[PDB]
Design a binder for this molecule. Structure first.
Ligand SMILES: N#Cc1ccc(O[C@@H]2c3ccccc3C[C@H]2N2CCC[C@@H](N)C2)c(Cl)c1
Ligand SMILES: [Ca+2]
Ligand SMILES: [Ca+2]
Ligand SMILES: [Ca+2]
Ligand SMILES: [Zn+2]
Lengths: 336, 100, 38, 68, 49
């Protein structure tokens, strides 16, 4: 290296704001793009150590390289203030989050080349950064079907199948993250269920990435269960379990429209259905017209079964003669 | 996970009888915008709780270093600041001494 | 907890930098009055 | 020499990832003390600095008072 | 290439040195861990090859 450049890199790494400011304003020969033993220039060192004051001073320079990689590094470490400061750079005007812009050295990029800022922020589940990027139009691209035979997919398969499959799992790791699920869609519970099913299907189709897709579908199940765990009153519980009761058709004979619960059972969420908030609603449906029999012990219920067994012809006779009756209403209950 | 596995099996059992379906047993069946408001309320509550749980994670070596670097930058800012404060000040007093 | 400690350092930085900047601004104004008096 | 180029690319990527994993380790009592010692040295530097700033300053004003 | 050869050498020395068998087995496992971790970072077929 050089004495001037080494001093500049040392000052930019260790937060020596006055020295870097003086060198930026007084040298005219030191190049801002000088790199250290690891190929990290002043901006990457300042971002890596979370030096916001040095970061802004460097960003005010015009010929500063590795700005996109600096944004990616700031996103991966959290550093909300530095991320916003870098987003203030003119290179990200109106959006760059949809070549070689994110390279961290002459050859290569710090992360996988398909990982854009929105995907990286979703991976780290930085809720503040994800909210910022979503507000600017950043979206994860929803990769096509595994057996899609279109031209764009076919070109990626021929160029590199290893990188194309890794790009697909990276996109799904971003979509399946709770940070992206809750902030991107109006109905995160509906989206999490459908994405959980899709990732479960892809685990069987892709044997190579079966463990990854099973892990991601478990994240969507965990999000929906955790979303149900926060409910505090019956109105919020019904909004998670049943859905939009206003636009739902209805449940049969006054029941709470179990369509979403049926979908959860099909997708084997296994923890959303087994949750105490969900079990309470199903138990009320189970003992539909038998309020007193819920509290009775198991011995009483055993005697009820024997009593029904002895009087079984009488109950059948009642159902034929008087379907719309006190006994007919009770018999149609799921527990009866 | 056994408790969760059984409760799902019981719930699948319940949904069998939820349908109107058949009421008589085997021997006798031969004979003939508040929702949008609540979702916004719960999504925000999820974000706050998710951030609380992230704050409940143990501190690592990387996080403590970012804190260490903060102290390091503060030292450079304050030492230069006070040194600059006296240099400009003593220059003014030097002008005062020249005026006499 | 470590963040609450980090925020302490962050607030201390704003207090000290403004404090010393205010100390010199009031001081240099007094010297400016001294220079005007000559 | 594409193999030498790729090995350099992967070695650098290994070093960066190795340092990230080391940063993912839990903080110990020794590391927190090094941070505590930083605060301790900063206190001595700043308190002496400001004390020196006023001592030199008040001496100059004392000379000004003598001049009258 | 170096990690593979050193892993083999330390594996041999674990059998020869009974006193330090646990140490040399531990060190040869480090060389295996390094080579596996180096392979784990590959992102495209060219780096994998
Ligand atoms: N409403 C209702 C409803 C009624 C009966 C049901 O299950 C039948 C039952 C009930 C008690 C004891 C043994 C059994 C055997 C079941 N059959 C059902 C028909 C198919 C056959 N494979 C198994 C179900 Cl699940 C729902
Ligand atoms: Ca900082
Ligand atoms: Ca942590
Ligand atoms: Ca440690
Ligand atoms: Zn396609």
């Amino acid at each position: 290296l050089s004495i001037e450049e080494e001093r500049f890199l040392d000052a930019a790494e260790y937060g020596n704001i006055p020295v870097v400011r003086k060198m930026l304003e007084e040298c005219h020969s030191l190049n801002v793009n000088c790199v250290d033993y690891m190929g990290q220039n002043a901006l990457q060192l300042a971002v890596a150590n979370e030096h916001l004051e040095i970061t802004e001073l460097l960003l005010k320079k015009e010929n500063l390289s590795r700005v996109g990689d600096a944004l990616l590094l700031a996103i991966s470490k959290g550093y909300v203030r530095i991320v916003e400061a870098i987003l203030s750079h003119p290179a990200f005007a109106e959006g760059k989050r949809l070549d070689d812009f994110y390279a961290y050295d002459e050859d290569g990029t710090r992360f996988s080349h398909d990982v854009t800022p929105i995907i990286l922020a979703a991976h780290c589940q930085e809720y503040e950064i994800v909210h910022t990027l979503l507000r600017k139009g950043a979206r994860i691209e929803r990769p096509h079907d595994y057996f899609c035979k279109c031209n764009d997919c076919n070109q990626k398969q021929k160029h590199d199948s290893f990188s194309h499959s890794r790009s697909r799992i990276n996109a799904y790791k971003g979509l399946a993250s709770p940070a992206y699920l809750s902030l991107s869609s109006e109905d995160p519970v509906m989206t999490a269920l459908e994405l959980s099913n899709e990732l479960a299907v892809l685990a069987n189709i892709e044997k190579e990435f079966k463990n990854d897709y099973k892990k991601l579908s478990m994240q969507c199940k965990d999000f929906v269960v955790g979303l149900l765990d926060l409910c505090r009153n019956t109105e919020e519980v019904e909004a998670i379990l049943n859905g939009d009761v206003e636009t739902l058709q209805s449940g049969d004979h006054g029941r709470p429209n179990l369509s979403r619960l049926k979908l959860a059972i099909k997708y084997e969420v296994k923890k959303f259905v087994a949750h105490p908030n969900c079990q309470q609603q199903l138990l009320s449906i189970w003992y539909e017209n038998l309020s007193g029999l819920r509290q009775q012990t198991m011995a009483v219920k055993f005697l009820v079964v024997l009593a029904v067994a002895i009087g079984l012809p009488f109950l059948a006779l009642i159902y034929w003669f008087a379907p719309c009756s006190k006994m007919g209403k009770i018999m149609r209950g799921p527990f009866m | 996970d056994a408790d969760v596995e059984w409760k799902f099996a019981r719930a699948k059992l319940w949904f069998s009888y939820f349908e109107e379906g058949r009421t008589l047993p085997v021997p006798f069946n031969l004979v003939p915008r508040q929702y949008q408001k609540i979702m916004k309320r719960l999504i925000k509550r999820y974000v706050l709780q998710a951030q609380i749980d992230k704050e409940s994670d143990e501190v690592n070596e990387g996080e403590l270093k970012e804190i260490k670097q903060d102290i390091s930058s503060l030292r450079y800012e304050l030492l230069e600041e006070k040194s600059q404060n006296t240099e400009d000040l003593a220059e003014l007093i030097r002008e005062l001494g020249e005026k006499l």
